[PDB]
Paper text:
The three Protein Phosphatase 1 ([name]) isoforms regulate diverse cellular processes, acting in partnership with over 200 different [name]-interacting proteins (PIPs). The four [name] (Phactr) proteins are novel PIPs that are implicated in cytoskeletal regulation in animal models and cell culture settings. Here, we show that [name] confers sequence-specificity on the [name]/[name] holoenzyme. We show that efficient catalysis requires interactions between conserved hydrophobic residues in the substrate and a novel [name]-[name] composite surface, which comprises a hydrophobic pocket and associated amphipathic cavity with a surrounding basic rim.
We also assessed the substrate specificity of a fusion protein in which the [name] residues 526–580 were fused via a short SG linker to [name] residue 304, solved at 1.78 Å resolution. This fusion protein lacks the RVxF-[name] interaction critical for formation of the authentic [name]/[name] complex, but nevertheless generates a composite hydrophobic surface virtually identical to that seen in the [name]/[name] holoenzyme (RMSD 0.25 Å over 2395 atoms). The [name]-[name] fusion protein behaved similarly to the [name]/[name] complex, indicating that RVxF interactions are not essential for specificity. We exploited the close approach of the [name] sequences to the [name] C-terminus to generate a [name]-[name] fusion, which has a similar specificity to intact [name]/[name] holoenzyme. This approach is likely to be applicable to PNUTS, PPP1R15A/B and spinophilin/neurabin, since these proteins all use an RVxF-ϕϕ-R-W string to bind [name] in a strikingly similar way to [name].
Author numbering: 6 to 298, 310 to 364
Write the structure that this text describes.
């Protein structure tokens, strides 16, 4: 792997017009996937990290906002980074986004961490853009190589034994951290249960305990669920993403939970800022945010609106895709022996 060549080419588009592509070869991206996958498997599924550290929420393929985020926070290894998932889909340059992130994971495996979001799974990113991007610029085989890599991402991270991090949120099935640790990879993300909730659930001040999630997936959880969780496991903060928030960061449950969203002007459909959170050695939290026109800075002004081909799917098309997902997951997608029960199949 010519990693430094790969990275330099991904960064060279800094200062170009947002949208311009980085031309990696099929084997270079195949290399990124296979080596990063090996590193993800060598590391815990429940990461145990230490401050200082910067944490980012969703990026969703907004590659040039990711460059601007690093320009603002520091390019690795100038800062340590944890990303909370959702690197692909919805944006137009998921491939450059994930490839840079995976390259930095190979370049700095001890100072750069990527958690699994609900969009790093085959059933979701098949629909919401990524699969289309791989087919267009490369081939279906490469989308399946990414799927193998995504199936090996860690699911959560604890920073200094006090900040619990995941993409979505808590689970009613999450009683012991050991339940996360015992999950075997490669694995799919199930249609319900602990691994589903960890990547899909949301907080809600209106809920006392657990409530209905408007997505039709997983649940919502209330502030008391947050407080009881923190007290039981002697934590101080939950850090998660998954939800657009006005200023890129938003506190919840007496500032015991924070939502981070790093994609400003998300999909060109919200007036939101993107935020990174800095955690220093003394566990102090602070924020830097990219706003469209606590430290502030102006976000890049380009057209983030993207085509939403899933809205055009016919019932016949949906059926065909479910058949494709089922065949792929049944005959090709590698799944650890102890995790086949988690493989999310679809109704015929
Ligand atoms: Mn999400
Ligand atoms: Mn998201």
């Amino acid at each position: 792997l010519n990693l430094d060549s790969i990275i330099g080419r991904l960064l060279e588009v800094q200062g170009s017009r947002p949208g311009k592509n980085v031309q990696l070869t099929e084997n270079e991206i195949r290399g990124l996937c296979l080596k990063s996958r090996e590193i993800f498997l060598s590391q815990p599924i429940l990461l145990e990290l230490e401050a200082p550290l910067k944490i980012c929420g969703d990026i969703h393929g907004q590659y040039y906002d990711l460059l601007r985020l690093f320009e603002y926070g520091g390019f690795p290894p100038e800062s340590n980074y944890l990303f909370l998932g959702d690197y692909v889909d919805r944006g137009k340059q998921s491939l450059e986004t994930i490839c840079l992130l995976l390259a930095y994971k190979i370049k700095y495996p001890e100072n750069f961490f990527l958690l699994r979001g609900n969009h790093e799974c085959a059933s979701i990113n098949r629909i919401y853009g990524f699969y289309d991007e791989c087919k267009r610029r490369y081939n279906i085989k490469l989308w399946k190589t990414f799927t193998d890599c995504f199936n090996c991402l860690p699911i959560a991270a604890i920073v200094d034994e006090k900040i619990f991090c995941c993409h979505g949120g808590l689970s009613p099935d999450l009683q012991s951290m050991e339940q996360i640790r015992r999950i075997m990879r490669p694995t799919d993300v199930p249609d319900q249960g602990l691994l589903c909730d960890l990547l899909w659930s949301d907080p809600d001040k209106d809920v006392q305990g657990w409530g209905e999630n408007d997505r039709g997936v997983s649940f919502t959880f209330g502030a008391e669920v947050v407080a009881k969780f923190l007290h039981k496991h002697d934590l101080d903060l939950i850090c998660r993403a998954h939800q657009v928030v006005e200023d890129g960061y938003e506190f919840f449950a007496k500032r015991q939970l924070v939502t981070l969203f790093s994609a400003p002007n998300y999909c060109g459909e919200f007036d939101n800022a993107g935020a990174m959170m800095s955690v220093d050695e003394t566990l102090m939290c602070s924020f830097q945010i990219l706003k469209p026109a606590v430290e502030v800075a102006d976000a890049q002004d380009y057209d983030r609106r993207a085509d939403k081909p899933w809205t055009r799917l016919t019932a016949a098309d949906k059926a065909a895709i479910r058949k494709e997902l089922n065949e792929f997951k049944s005959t090709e997608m590698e799944v650890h022996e102890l995790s086949r029960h988690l493989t999310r199949f679809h109704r015929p």
